[PDB]
């Protein structure tokens, strides 16, 4: 491209429990529409399976944020339309439901950083 391309991170809203599968669907739709060029690195704050271990106490809460996924890609009419075609997808998260405002790359790292955070010392 005459001008250096810029990659931006976008948030994807999906139903809880299927957030992991939703990401897999992107690879299929993107691979079929050859949109991989736009998608750079998708993030998955949820695991396809769950661990037997759980909160030490029921009163305790979870800092995990299911239903939210981060994906790096360029905002365009193709990808955008491709995202809507993705099944089990509520929509995008940004200023409006038709154009997700881009966020700094460091901000995207903070979101995933929260998932790594654990309640080693519950109070």
Distances (CA, A) of 91 to 56, 97, 99: 34, 7, 10
What residues pair up with 10 in beta bridges, in sequence order?
Answer: 71
| Cβ 39 vs Cβ 24: under 8 Å | no
Architecture of domain 1-123: 2-Layer Sandwich (3.30)
| Cβ 92 vs Cβ 8: under 8 Å | no
d(C-alpha 24, C-alpha 75), whole Å: 20
The token duo for 74 is 């360029």
Residues in the chain: 123
d(C-alpha 103, C-alpha 59), whole Å: 34
d(C-alpha 11, C-alpha 75), whole Å: 12
Distances (CA, A) of 101 to 10, 24, 34, 58: 8, 23, 24, 37
CA angle centred on 75, ends 71 and 80, rounded to 5°: 85
What residues pair up with 89 in beta bridges, in sequence order?
Answer: 14
Three-state DSSP class for residue 82: helix
| Cβ 39 vs Cβ 73: under 8 Å | yes
Method used for this model?
Answer: NMR
């Amino acid at each position: 491209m005459s001008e250096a391309p810029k990659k931006r991170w976008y948030v994807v809203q999906a139903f809880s429990g299927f957030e992991g599968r939703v990401a897999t669907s992107l690879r299929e739709h993107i691979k079929l529409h050859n949109m991989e060029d736009l998608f750079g690195e998708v993030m998955v704050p949820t695991e396809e399976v769950v661990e037997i271990r759980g909160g030490q106490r029921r009163k305790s809460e979870r800092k995990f944020f299911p239903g939210y996924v981060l994906v790096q890609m360029v905002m365009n009419d193709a990808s955008w339309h491709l995202v809507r075609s993705v099944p089990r997808v509520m929509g995008f998260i940004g200023g409006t439901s038709d154009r997700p405002a881009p966020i700094s790359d460091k901000e995207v790292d903070a979101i995933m950083n929260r998932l790594q955070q654990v309640g080693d010392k519950p109070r």
